Amino acid sequence: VHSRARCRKNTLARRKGRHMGIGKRKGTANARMPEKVTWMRRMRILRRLLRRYRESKKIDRHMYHSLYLKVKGNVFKNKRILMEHIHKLKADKARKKLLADQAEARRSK
Amino acid sequence: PRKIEEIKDFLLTARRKDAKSVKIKKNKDNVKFKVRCSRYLYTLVITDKEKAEKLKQSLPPGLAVKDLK
Amino acid sequence: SSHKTFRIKRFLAKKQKQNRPIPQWIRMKTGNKIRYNSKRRHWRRTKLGL
Amino acid sequence: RTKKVGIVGKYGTRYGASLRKMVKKIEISQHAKYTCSFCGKTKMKRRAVGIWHCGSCMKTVAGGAWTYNTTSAVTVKSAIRRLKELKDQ
RNA sequence: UCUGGUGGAGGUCCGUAGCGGUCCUGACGUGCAAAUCGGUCGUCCGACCUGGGUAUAGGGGCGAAAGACUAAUCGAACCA
RNA sequence: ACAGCAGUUGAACAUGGGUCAGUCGGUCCUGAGAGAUGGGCGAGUGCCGUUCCGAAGGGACGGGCGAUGGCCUCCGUUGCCCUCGGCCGAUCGAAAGGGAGUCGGGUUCAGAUCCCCGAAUCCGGAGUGGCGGAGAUGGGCGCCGCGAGGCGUCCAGUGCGGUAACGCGACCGAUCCCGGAGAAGCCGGCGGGAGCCUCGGGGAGAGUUCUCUUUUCUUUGUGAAGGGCAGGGCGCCCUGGAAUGGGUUCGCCCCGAGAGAGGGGCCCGUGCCUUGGAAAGCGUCGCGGUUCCGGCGGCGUCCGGUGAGCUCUCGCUGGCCCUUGAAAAUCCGGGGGAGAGGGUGUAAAUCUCGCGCCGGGCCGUACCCAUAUCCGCAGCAGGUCUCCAAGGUGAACAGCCUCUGGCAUGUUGGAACAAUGUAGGUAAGGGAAGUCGGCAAGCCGGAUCCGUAACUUCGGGAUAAGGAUUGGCUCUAAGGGCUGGGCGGCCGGCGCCUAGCAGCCGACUUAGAACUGGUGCGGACCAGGGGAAUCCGACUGUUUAAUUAAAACAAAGCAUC
Ligand SMILES: [Zn+2]
């Protein structure tokens, strides 16, 4: 017999965060988790989200292209931050039409 | 091995002078009629038992028949 | 090696067949002087001319 | 990233400063992509010494060792045109 | 011009396999061994390591050069 | 007898036995090179030479002119004459280069992709056509036939479809010509597929049960060759005309020489299903005969999830090079159109389509492949080219422990534990006072967070130097994927997902905090002491195999002839 019961018990604790402190790390942060894979995974998430927003007409081509290059320029840390920024832009664009319609109404009055 | 999907084609293959034997196998879901020729073993898969018994009666005479029981 | 030529195999066949002990009745022949095969060859001790 | 070493930062300290400076100019020109005079696209790379290829129109041109056009080539081409025109007219 | 990313260059660094062989002037020194053993060491993408096949033969060859190597033989091998 | 003790043992000795191929190699091709003839040289055995000082073809579409044999109206075989024709030269050279075609199951004391069973496949031959299918069987003028459908005459027919990319089962054709494949470096980064590992369940068997554990361990297939479908790729096509430039990758990169969007086409398909196929194999539970029956029988061989995981492989796309990373046999495609076929038969020449018939000779094949089958005088701590490569820890093919498999401690054992030694440790207080000399040993060592000087060729020096943390346990926060949006549908205004909401699924980390231990925690393993200077060589590299690795040699650069 070569049971895996002991290693399975330790893996369960390790998934909770145990045996993974400063005294249990031998490789560098990059050896443990490469910065390139973290970046490449991040781009695939954020580019996929931008593509879905364009397809569902939440943002247009011109908002897609500016946001694409800002994603490449390391502006947004995660999906949640990028979602909030899009919402701020949508509010700003709506407001610019709100005061535009107000100004047109005032001038035509 | 070749799979034949028509009964008419199977009878033509069985009546070839090249054909050597017909092996009938019964499975849980289908019955397979296998004719051994020079180059290929031709298999016909039939999922209806009523048509299966008909094929046994219409098999050409003289050709060896073996039941894989 | 396993890969060998026909000429080499026939050469090894002959050395194999001549590596036998002297027959027992030879000692009984009139005027015999041979007591054992002095040309016996062991594979590990002595190597072939090939 | 660097102050002055540019492309010859791959050599570190391993050769003289002047030798790295001289090869800096040549290595920029030998790895640059030029505009193709035949198709207009900026895809004229270097295959080997003296061989320049365009990856769009698939044209191969004999050029310089590190630059696409040598100054000696331009002068000779202009001189041959003058000599040909004098012969004709 | 500055900043943060991306990128992955290099006869680049640490260091495995491999290649080599510093020091202990350690072991052994009628040895395991007519040159080996241990720890420690150099290098480890390059002028890198390596099998087979080929070419160069003795006043000749080959030599990033030590008169080095050329079948335990080299300031001209071995055989008669 | 030998295997340095023994030996009931052996790679010893003796007696027998053992290597099975069209599809695994050799055999064939050329490579670096080797090597005849012609020629030249040479007293001479001979040597140089490999296209160079040669009349270097012995073959063939086809046509003609004659003999001959036949299933002899006719065709075929054999000589002679025209036509074509560069060998850009014989020949040898690789059991790792190129090179058509075989793989499952069983079987031995020892063979096996080679024997048996089964299922395939390549090449060659078939003349006297092996059978089908294709070519290839239409149209016009009339007449008869109620009309269909037949009679006569005339004219076609070396296939067909798609705008295209190309497709379909064939789809004539010589000398000659063009092209392709064979046929190409190294490094990096991504993606697809498989194998392995992993996780959650369901079976069958086994282990533990002092207490717990619904547990822990094992096992849980579908070869080649066909057919279909995923999936991957594409500088392939059609519509169309883009700036408020857009598309898009981890990186790039792409576009009026035609982007995005839509619709097609091709290649590969080692993946899945299917024929092969469950009849076989494996697991487990039973029943027989007898040494073996591939005995017989029942049940099973199931459903999922993950991933920068490792390995192999297929792709795409880049970097480097004063380095550009074989040749030839062999096979194929195209251009051209010299020719052949038949006059309307149910026909011809022709066919790279489907099936059918026959054959594949010669040589190798056992075993070791190394702390005992090889070389070193030997069962010699030396040397000797490769392939596959599980779990845990951890950056790791590191070291340490384990499973599959293997072994018996390396040519002996028993007892004791003296000196000296070889190898491994420890040491109070000093801390190099030893010694030629810190030789030897010791200190440091991982990772995270801070902080880093002189000098400098501005690249570095740099892990400079210096400091802090590191265990266990319990939590917290952040970092993603899929589906959906007003019995079964839907003709519909009647709905509005819009600070992204609901449900479901999922792995790996990072940061912060509390608690806690005799402050112990990179707890073993792995694992840089550092600084200030002088001399030499610039650096990397090389060297006296067996006493000198260095400042010696080389090197880029400079200069000279
Ligand atoms: Zn161009």
mmCIF file of N, CA, C and O in Angstrom, chain B residues 5-69:
data_model
loop_
_atom_site.group_PDB
_atom_site.id
_atom_site.type_symbol
_atom_site.label_atom_id
_atom_site.label_comp_id
_atom_site.label_asym_id
_atom_site.label_seq_id
_atom_site.Cartn_x
_atom_site.Cartn_y
_atom_site.Cartn_z
ATOM 1 N N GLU B 5 -24.691 -1.076 -45.404
ATOM 2 C CA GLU B 5 -25.891 -0.521 -44.792
ATOM 3 C C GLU B 5 -27.164 -0.921 -45.528
ATOM 4 O O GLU B 5 -28.237 -0.387 -45.232
ATOM 5 N N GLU B 6 -27.074 -1.851 -46.473
ATOM 6 C CA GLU B 6 -28.230 -2.262 -47.258
ATOM 7 C C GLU B 6 -28.310 -3.778 -47.289
ATOM 8 O O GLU B 6 -27.283 -4.456 -47.374
ATOM 9 N N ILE B 7 -29.533 -4.304 -47.211
ATOM 10 C CA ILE B 7 -29.731 -5.747 -47.297
ATOM 11 C C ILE B 7 -29.456 -6.240 -48.711
ATOM 12 O O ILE B 7 -28.868 -7.311 -48.907
ATOM 13 N N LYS B 8 -29.871 -5.469 -49.718
ATOM 14 C CA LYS B 8 -29.664 -5.875 -51.103
ATOM 15 C C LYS B 8 -28.181 -6.014 -51.417
ATOM 16 O O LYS B 8 -27.765 -6.950 -52.108
ATOM 17 N N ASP B 9 -27.367 -5.082 -50.919
ATOM 18 C CA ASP B 9 -25.927 -5.187 -51.115
ATOM 19 C C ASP B 9 -25.364 -6.407 -50.399
ATOM 20 O O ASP B 9 -24.450 -7.066 -50.906
ATOM 21 N N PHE B 10 -25.900 -6.727 -49.220
ATOM 22 C CA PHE B 10 -25.410 -7.883 -48.476
ATOM 23 C C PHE B 10 -25.657 -9.179 -49.235
ATOM 24 O O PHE B 10 -24.799 -10.068 -49.254
ATOM 25 N N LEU B 11 -26.832 -9.314 -49.853
ATOM 26 C CA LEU B 11 -27.122 -10.518 -50.621
ATOM 27 C C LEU B 11 -26.195 -10.640 -51.823
ATOM 28 O O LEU B 11 -25.767 -11.746 -52.174
ATOM 29 N N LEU B 12 -25.876 -9.517 -52.468
ATOM 30 C CA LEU B 12 -24.929 -9.543 -53.578
ATOM 31 C C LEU B 12 -23.553 -9.996 -53.111
ATOM 32 O O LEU B 12 -22.888 -10.794 -53.781
ATOM 33 N N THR B 13 -23.105 -9.489 -51.961
ATOM 34 C CA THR B 13 -21.805 -9.890 -51.434
ATOM 35 C C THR B 13 -21.794 -11.362 -51.046
ATOM 36 O O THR B 13 -20.789 -12.055 -51.239
ATOM 37 N N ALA B 14 -22.900 -11.855 -50.487
ATOM 38 C CA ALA B 14 -22.959 -13.251 -50.067
ATOM 39 C C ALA B 14 -22.918 -14.194 -51.263
ATOM 40 O O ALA B 14 -22.329 -15.278 -51.189
ATOM 41 N N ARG B 15 -23.535 -13.801 -52.372
ATOM 42 C CA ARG B 15 -23.595 -14.658 -53.549
ATOM 43 C C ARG B 15 -22.351 -14.557 -54.421
ATOM 44 O O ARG B 15 -22.298 -15.207 -55.469
ATOM 45 N N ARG B 16 -21.365 -13.758 -54.024
ATOM 46 C CA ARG B 16 -20.084 -13.744 -54.715
ATOM 47 C C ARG B 16 -19.416 -15.109 -54.621
ATOM 48 O O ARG B 16 -19.459 -15.769 -53.579
ATOM 49 N N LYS B 17 -18.796 -15.539 -55.721
ATOM 50 C CA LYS B 17 -18.040 -16.786 -55.696
ATOM 51 C C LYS B 17 -16.803 -16.679 -54.818
ATOM 52 O O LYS B 17 -16.206 -17.703 -54.472
ATOM 53 N N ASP B 18 -16.411 -15.460 -54.461
ATOM 54 C CA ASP B 18 -15.296 -15.248 -53.552
ATOM 55 C C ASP B 18 -15.699 -15.530 -52.107
ATOM 56 O O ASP B 18 -14.872 -15.988 -51.312
ATOM 57 N N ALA B 19 -16.964 -15.287 -51.760
ATOM 58 C CA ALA B 19 -17.431 -15.424 -50.385
ATOM 59 C C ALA B 19 -17.194 -16.831 -49.855
ATOM 60 O O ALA B 19 -17.418 -17.821 -50.556
ATOM 61 N N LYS B 20 -16.734 -16.913 -48.609
ATOM 62 C CA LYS B 20 -16.350 -18.175 -47.990
ATOM 63 C C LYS B 20 -17.302 -18.624 -46.893
ATOM 64 O O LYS B 20 -17.662 -19.804 -46.841
ATOM 65 N N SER B 21 -17.714 -17.723 -46.006
ATOM 66 C CA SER B 21 -18.584 -18.105 -44.906
ATOM 67 C C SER B 21 -19.419 -16.914 -44.468
ATOM 68 O O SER B 21 -19.052 -15.755 -44.682
ATOM 69 N N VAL B 22 -20.555 -17.219 -43.846
ATOM 70 C CA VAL B 22 -21.412 -16.234 -43.199
ATOM 71 C C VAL B 22 -21.430 -16.552 -41.715
ATOM 72 O O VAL B 22 -21.828 -17.652 -41.316
ATOM 73 N N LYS B 23 -21.004 -15.598 -40.900
ATOM 74 C CA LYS B 23 -21.008 -15.738 -39.453
ATOM 75 C C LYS B 23 -22.058 -14.809 -38.868
ATOM 76 O O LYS B 23 -21.962 -13.587 -39.013
ATOM 77 N N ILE B 24 -23.054 -15.391 -38.205
ATOM 78 C CA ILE B 24 -24.122 -14.643 -37.558
ATOM 79 C C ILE B 24 -23.786 -14.511 -36.083
ATOM 80 O O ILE B 24 -23.484 -15.507 -35.417
ATOM 81 N N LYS B 25 -23.839 -13.286 -35.575
ATOM 82 C CA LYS B 25 -23.638 -13.021 -34.161
ATOM 83 C C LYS B 25 -24.845 -12.286 -33.603
ATOM 84 O O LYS B 25 -25.372 -11.374 -34.245
ATOM 85 N N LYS B 26 -25.277 -12.688 -32.415
ATOM 86 C CA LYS B 26 -26.379 -12.043 -31.718
ATOM 87 C C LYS B 26 -25.813 -11.259 -30.543
ATOM 88 O O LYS B 26 -25.108 -11.814 -29.696
ATOM 89 N N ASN B 27 -26.111 -9.967 -30.505
ATOM 90 C CA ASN B 27 -25.725 -9.102 -29.408
ATOM 91 C C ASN B 27 -26.967 -8.701 -28.619
ATOM 92 O O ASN B 27 -28.086 -9.132 -28.904
ATOM 93 N N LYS B 28 -26.763 -7.859 -27.607
ATOM 94 C CA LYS B 28 -27.886 -7.415 -26.791
ATOM 95 C C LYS B 28 -28.808 -6.484 -27.566
ATOM 96 O O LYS B 28 -30.017 -6.455 -27.306
ATOM 97 N N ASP B 29 -28.267 -5.724 -28.519
ATOM 98 C CA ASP B 29 -29.037 -4.724 -29.243
ATOM 99 C C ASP B 29 -29.235 -5.028 -30.720
ATOM 100 O O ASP B 29 -30.241 -4.596 -31.288
ATOM 101 N N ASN B 30 -28.315 -5.748 -31.358
ATOM 102 C CA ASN B 30 -28.384 -5.962 -32.796
ATOM 103 C C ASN B 30 -27.917 -7.375 -33.120
ATOM 104 O O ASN B 30 -27.424 -8.105 -32.257
ATOM 105 N N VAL B 31 -28.085 -7.754 -34.382
ATOM 106 C CA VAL B 31 -27.565 -8.999 -34.931
ATOM 107 C C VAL B 31 -26.684 -8.646 -36.116
ATOM 108 O O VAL B 31 -27.093 -7.872 -36.989
ATOM 109 N N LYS B 32 -25.476 -9.197 -36.147
ATOM 110 C CA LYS B 32 -24.492 -8.860 -37.163
ATOM 111 C C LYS B 32 -24.276 -10.044 -38.093
ATOM 112 O O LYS B 32 -23.966 -11.150 -37.640
ATOM 113 N N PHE B 33 -24.446 -9.805 -39.389
ATOM 114 C CA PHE B 33 -24.196 -10.793 -40.429
ATOM 115 C C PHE B 33 -22.861 -10.465 -41.079
ATOM 116 O O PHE B 33 -22.705 -9.390 -41.667
ATOM 117 N N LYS B 34 -21.907 -11.383 -40.980
ATOM 118 C CA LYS B 34 -20.552 -11.158 -41.465
ATOM 119 C C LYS B 34 -20.239 -12.148 -42.575
ATOM 120 O O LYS B 34 -20.293 -13.361 -42.362
ATOM 121 N N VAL B 35 -19.902 -11.627 -43.750
ATOM 122 C CA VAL B 35 -19.499 -12.435 -44.891
ATOM 123 C C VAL B 35 -18.012 -12.224 -45.128
ATOM 124 O O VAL B 35 -17.559 -11.089 -45.313
ATOM 125 N N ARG B 36 -17.254 -13.313 -45.124
ATOM 126 C CA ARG B 36 -15.808 -13.263 -45.297
ATOM 127 C C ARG B 36 -15.482 -13.476 -46.770
ATOM 128 O O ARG B 36 -15.784 -14.530 -47.334
ATOM 129 N N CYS B 37 -14.875 -12.477 -47.392
ATOM 130 C CA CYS B 37 -14.431 -12.547 -48.773
ATOM 131 C C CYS B 37 -12.908 -12.519 -48.819
ATOM 132 O O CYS B 37 -12.230 -12.583 -47.791
ATOM 133 N N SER B 38 -12.369 -12.437 -50.035
ATOM 134 C CA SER B 38 -10.920 -12.472 -50.201
ATOM 135 C C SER B 38 -10.253 -11.291 -49.517
ATOM 136 O O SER B 38 -9.247 -11.456 -48.819
ATOM 137 N N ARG B 39 -10.796 -10.097 -49.702
ATOM 138 C CA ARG B 39 -10.143 -8.879 -49.254
ATOM 139 C C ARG B 39 -10.767 -8.280 -48.007
ATOM 140 O O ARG B 39 -10.041 -7.846 -47.111
ATOM 141 N N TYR B 40 -12.091 -8.260 -47.912
ATOM 142 C CA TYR B 40 -12.769 -7.598 -46.813
ATOM 143 C C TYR B 40 -13.748 -8.543 -46.137
ATOM 144 O O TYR B 40 -14.284 -9.464 -46.756
ATOM 145 N N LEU B 41 -13.966 -8.301 -44.850
ATOM 146 C CA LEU B 41 -15.033 -8.930 -44.089
ATOM 147 C C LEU B 41 -16.191 -7.946 -44.005
ATOM 148 O O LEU B 41 -16.100 -6.932 -43.307
ATOM 149 N N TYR B 42 -17.270 -8.246 -44.715
ATOM 150 C CA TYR B 42 -18.418 -7.360 -44.821
ATOM 151 C C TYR B 42 -19.408 -7.663 -43.708
ATOM 152 O O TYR B 42 -19.859 -8.802 -43.563
ATOM 153 N N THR B 43 -19.745 -6.641 -42.929
ATOM 154 C CA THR B 43 -20.643 -6.771 -41.793
ATOM 155 C C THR B 43 -21.914 -5.978 -42.060
ATOM 156 O O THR B 43 -21.853 -4.840 -42.535
ATOM 157 N N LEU B 44 -23.059 -6.587 -41.767
ATOM 158 C CA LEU B 44 -24.358 -5.930 -41.832
ATOM 159 C C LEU B 44 -24.984 -5.958 -40.446
ATOM 160 O O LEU B 44 -25.117 -7.028 -39.846
ATOM 161 N N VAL B 45 -25.364 -4.789 -39.941
ATOM 162 C CA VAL B 45 -25.913 -4.645 -38.599
ATOM 163 C C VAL B 45 -27.412 -4.414 -38.720
ATOM 164 O O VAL B 45 -27.850 -3.445 -39.353
ATOM 165 N N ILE B 46 -28.197 -5.300 -38.113
ATOM 166 C CA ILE B 46 -29.653 -5.247 -38.161
ATOM 167 C C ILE B 46 -30.175 -5.166 -36.734
ATOM 168 O O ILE B 46 -29.831 -6.005 -35.895
ATOM 169 N N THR B 47 -31.003 -4.160 -36.462
ATOM 170 C CA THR B 47 -31.525 -3.917 -35.124
ATOM 171 C C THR B 47 -32.922 -4.489 -34.903
ATOM 172 O O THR B 47 -33.468 -4.334 -33.807
ATOM 173 N N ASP B 48 -33.510 -5.143 -35.902
ATOM 174 C CA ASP B 48 -34.838 -5.739 -35.789
ATOM 175 C C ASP B 48 -34.699 -7.252 -35.887
ATOM 176 O O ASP B 48 -34.139 -7.766 -36.861
ATOM 177 N N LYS B 49 -35.212 -7.964 -34.882
ATOM 178 C CA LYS B 49 -35.111 -9.419 -34.886
ATOM 179 C C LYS B 49 -35.997 -10.042 -35.955
ATOM 180 O O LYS B 49 -35.678 -11.117 -36.475
ATOM 181 N N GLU B 50 -37.115 -9.395 -36.289
ATOM 182 C CA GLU B 50 -37.983 -9.924 -37.336
ATOM 183 C C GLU B 50 -37.267 -9.958 -38.679
ATOM 184 O O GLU B 50 -37.370 -10.941 -39.422
ATOM 185 N N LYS B 51 -36.531 -8.893 -39.008
ATOM 186 C CA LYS B 51 -35.756 -8.891 -40.243
ATOM 187 C C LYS B 51 -34.556 -9.823 -40.153
ATOM 188 O O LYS B 51 -34.081 -10.319 -41.181
ATOM 189 N N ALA B 52 -34.051 -10.068 -38.942
ATOM 190 C CA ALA B 52 -32.898 -10.944 -38.783
ATOM 191 C C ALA B 52 -33.229 -12.379 -39.174
ATOM 192 O O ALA B 52 -32.450 -13.033 -39.876
ATOM 193 N N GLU B 53 -34.380 -12.889 -38.727
ATOM 194 C CA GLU B 53 -34.758 -14.256 -39.069
ATOM 195 C C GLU B 53 -35.053 -14.391 -40.556
ATOM 196 O O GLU B 53 -34.832 -15.455 -41.146
ATOM 197 N N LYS B 54 -35.558 -13.325 -41.177
ATOM 198 C CA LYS B 54 -35.779 -13.346 -42.619
ATOM 199 C C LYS B 54 -34.468 -13.500 -43.376
ATOM 200 O O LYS B 54 -34.401 -14.227 -44.373
ATOM 201 N N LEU B 55 -33.414 -12.822 -42.917
ATOM 202 C CA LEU B 55 -32.134 -12.877 -43.616
ATOM 203 C C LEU B 55 -31.534 -14.275 -43.571
ATOM 204 O O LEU B 55 -30.876 -14.706 -44.524
ATOM 205 N N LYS B 56 -31.739 -14.995 -42.467
ATOM 206 C CA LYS B 56 -31.227 -16.357 -42.372
ATOM 207 C C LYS B 56 -31.865 -17.255 -43.423
ATOM 208 O O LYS B 56 -31.187 -18.090 -44.034
ATOM 209 N N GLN B 57 -33.170 -17.095 -43.648
ATOM 210 C CA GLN B 57 -33.862 -17.915 -44.634
ATOM 211 C C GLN B 57 -33.413 -17.581 -46.051
ATOM 212 O O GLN B 57 -33.346 -18.466 -46.910
ATOM 213 N N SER B 58 -33.098 -16.315 -46.315
ATOM 214 C CA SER B 58 -32.725 -15.879 -47.653
ATOM 215 C C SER B 58 -31.230 -15.987 -47.924
ATOM 216 O O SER B 58 -30.777 -15.546 -48.985
ATOM 217 N N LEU B 59 -30.459 -16.544 -46.998
ATOM 218 C CA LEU B 59 -29.032 -16.711 -47.225
ATOM 219 C C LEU B 59 -28.804 -17.698 -48.369
ATOM 220 O O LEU B 59 -29.548 -18.676 -48.501
ATOM 221 N N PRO B 60 -27.795 -17.471 -49.215
ATOM 222 C CA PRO B 60 -27.622 -18.328 -50.384
ATOM 223 C C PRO B 60 -27.248 -19.741 -49.977
ATOM 224 O O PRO B 60 -26.542 -19.948 -48.976
ATOM 225 N N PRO B 61 -27.701 -20.746 -50.722
ATOM 226 C CA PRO B 61 -27.362 -22.131 -50.384
ATOM 227 C C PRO B 61 -25.894 -22.430 -50.641
ATOM 228 O O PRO B 61 -25.222 -21.774 -51.440
ATOM 229 N N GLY B 62 -25.399 -23.446 -49.940
ATOM 230 C CA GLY B 62 -24.035 -23.897 -50.126
ATOM 231 C C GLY B 62 -23.016 -23.130 -49.307
ATOM 232 O O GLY B 62 -22.009 -23.696 -48.872
ATOM 233 N N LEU B 63 -23.263 -21.839 -49.101
ATOM 234 C CA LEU B 63 -22.336 -21.016 -48.338
ATOM 235 C C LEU B 63 -22.350 -21.431 -46.874
ATOM 236 O O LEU B 63 -23.416 -21.599 -46.274
ATOM 237 N N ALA B 64 -21.160 -21.606 -46.303
ATOM 238 C CA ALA B 64 -21.052 -22.047 -44.920
ATOM 239 C C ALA B 64 -21.643 -21.006 -43.982
ATOM 240 O O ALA B 64 -21.448 -19.803 -44.162
ATOM 241 N N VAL B 65 -22.382 -21.475 -42.982
ATOM 242 C CA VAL B 65 -23.010 -20.610 -41.992
ATOM 243 C C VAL B 65 -22.564 -21.060 -40.610
ATOM 244 O O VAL B 65 -22.708 -22.237 -40.260
ATOM 245 N N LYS B 66 -22.026 -20.129 -39.830
ATOM 246 C CA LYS B 66 -21.593 -20.400 -38.469
ATOM 247 C C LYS B 66 -22.259 -19.417 -37.520
ATOM 248 O O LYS B 66 -22.245 -18.204 -37.746
ATOM 249 N N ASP B 67 -22.839 -19.951 -36.452
ATOM 250 C CA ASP B 67 -23.480 -19.150 -35.420
ATOM 251 C C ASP B 67 -22.524 -19.007 -34.247
ATOM 252 O O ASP B 67 -22.081 -20.010 -33.676
ATOM 253 N N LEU B 68 -22.206 -17.763 -33.894
ATOM 254 C CA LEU B 68 -21.245 -17.477 -32.832
ATOM 255 C C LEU B 68 -21.981 -17.473 -31.497
ATOM 256 O O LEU B 68 -22.292 -16.430 -30.916
ATOM 257 N N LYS B 69 -22.262 -18.673 -31.004
ATOM 258 C CA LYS B 69 -22.939 -18.835 -29.723
ATOM 259 C C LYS B 69 -21.965 -19.321 -28.654
ATOM 260 O O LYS B 69 -20.966 -19.973 -28.957
#
